[PDB]
């Protein structure tokens, strides 16, 4: 008999063909041939980690910023057809707009005709800043005659004001082959322009999965285009007298694609609430859509996945967190589903590290207590839940110096929707563990040396500064 070599990957596909059989292909999909999109300088600059400092309270080395925006700038700039982006509102601004802006420049100089489709998600006390056709004008003012030679679709959207769902993604892909995710929505949103600049994860890839992510955003369009005269849903701008490009990325590149790597890949998002009501074809039989909406979990997928994922996990788990529980009423606290599995884990002796954001910006005791609670519906008292949890979790917030606080007195803040299982399996997108009912977008990735690349560069040191802050640390014998 043969062994499989992507066990964790397997794991996750067997759940999601049973929650979401009948969005395989558009909203998750399994892909194998890829290639994580790093130089031959640095083999592992796939990972686009924001600033990239440690060991220094005054961030000196902003490496890691400075690559996000060539990277941006190169890959646009190599675009011979599509360029298809989403954020969350605003409108691209300051760094990130000089980079597109310089891309399609690039871009346009080698003679392309490009079409180009900027997708944003509105809160509805956001609404009135975002203002498409403004944003269209400014851009082609920007570009020139580079203009000339670009189709282009501008859109804010909220798919529900009653349950708070508006895109979340963070994606940018060109030609339907390169593809850029993670939790970076704009250069001062993480305070990138600041010598108290927020920690932050994206990834960069090519290949089969890079096309998996526009079809993803085929998904979204396909719904605004329909939605675009509803104002209270969509305001939509195109250049000249262009259409609605609904499924620009169906269109204007294939389906079958060309391997570039040996990466196996799952791309995996989530609808939110009110663009699709329920996958017809799923025969799952598992208000508060993370904990008690059947029909919700079958349109998003992503959260299924995170839960399987941890679920996967043979050895240790980290977790890299803003945070893992929610204050936005009515959202729910927290997910249940997914305590509960962080808690079957310890309680089979599996190891879990829980790293979030500085409540500044106790936040560790609602966590503690939680996983707490959740052992002891599992060991059966809370004396077996502590020792389950005090011999298996570290809990602390972020840091990223020997310094408590950054050398200019504010608190680190970290952004992180990152996942790692085993040194093996890792999630990097944009979808955040606590609850949240947005359109959401991320990889996971199974590949021992890139998840030894993660550990190497983010994780190791992360923790390095961040256990002086631990409220639980079995490593130590810390449980307060």
Known sequence: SADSATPHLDAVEQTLRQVS??????????????????????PSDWLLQTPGCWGDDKCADRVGTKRLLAKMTENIGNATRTVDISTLAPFPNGAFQDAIVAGLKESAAKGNKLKV?????????????????????????????????????????TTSKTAFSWNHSKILVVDGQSALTGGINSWKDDYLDTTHPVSDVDLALTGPAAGSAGRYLDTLWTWTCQNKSNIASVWFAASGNAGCMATMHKDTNPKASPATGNVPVIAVGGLGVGIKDVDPKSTFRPHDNTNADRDYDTVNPEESAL?????????????????????????????????????????????????????????????????????????GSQQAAKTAMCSNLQLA?????????????????????????????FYIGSKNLYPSWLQDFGYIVESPEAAKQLDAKLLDPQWKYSQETATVDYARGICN
């Not at 043979?314 to 249940?336: F, G, M, V």
């Not at 910006?361 to 707490?372: A, G, P």
């Open 21 to 42: 059989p009948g969005l395989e292909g558009d909203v998750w999909e399994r892909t194998s041939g890829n290639k994580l999109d790093g130089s031959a300088a640095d």
């Open 117 to 157: 489709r900027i997708l944003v998600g509105a809160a509805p006390v956001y609404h009135m800043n975002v203002m498409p056709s403004k944003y269209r004008d400014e851009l082609t003012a920007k570009l020139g005659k580079a203009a000339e030679n670009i189709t282009l679709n501008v859109a804010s959207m």
């Open 307 to 379: 839960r399987a994922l941890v679920a996967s996990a043979k050895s240790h788990i980290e977790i890299s967190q803003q945070d893992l529980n929610a204050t936005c009423p009515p959202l729910p606290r927290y997910d249940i589903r997914l305590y509960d599995a962080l808690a079957a884990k310890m309680a089979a002796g599996v190891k879990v590290r829980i790293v979030v954001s500085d409540p500044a910006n106790k936040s560790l005791s609602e966590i503690s207590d939680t996983l707490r609670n959740r052992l002891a519906n599992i060991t």
């Open 397 to 425: 917030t972020f840091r990223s110096s020997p310094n408590d606080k950054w050398a200019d007195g504010h608190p680190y803040a970290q952004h992180h929707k990152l996942v790692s299982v085993d040194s093996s399996t």
